[PDB]
Design a protein around this ligand. Sequence first.
Ligand code: HEM
Length: 152
Amino acid sequence: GLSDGEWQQVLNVWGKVEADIAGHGQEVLIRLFTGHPETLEKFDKFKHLKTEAEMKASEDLKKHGTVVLTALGGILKKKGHHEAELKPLAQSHATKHKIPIKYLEFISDAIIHVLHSKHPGDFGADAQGAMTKALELFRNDIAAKYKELGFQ
Ligand code: HEM
């Protein structure tokens, strides 16, 4: 549940991500993998990445960063009316990829970190608040589909 003003802040912030979707995507995943090494083990196609140099040097990691943020952006543009978009992602990540809701908390915090890192002093207190709310809404609606499936 976000206000109209809050949704406007979220979509304003997203303009930054849209100027460099791959760069933001790559940094969000690198921050996830480096901060939480177990998350890398969920990706059979990125397990071979033994170093952050290998990570930064991976074209396919950049590619998947674009896939992830494009999907998230689509959802954010629905301003909460995202059932059709979110349900299949929830179901894929629980049933096929086996991703605990904890890892979605990790990637949420990682998005906040990357925005401050790439835009220092240009990601204000109101902006962080609005983006956090959106990411919690997203996370919480996925958690609901996880409880439905009894997935832990
Ligand atoms: C902001 C949250 C995220 C979004 C928007 C997102 C989105 C996506 C999309 C669109 C795909 C491809 C289609 C599909 O399989 O459903 C995908 C694949 C996948 N996701 Fe995510 N995802 C998120 C978070 C996570 C996290 C936190 C992990 C792991 C720690 C994860 C692991 C995977 C894996 C293992 C695949 C398959 C990669 C492959 O082999 O091609 N995801 N994701």
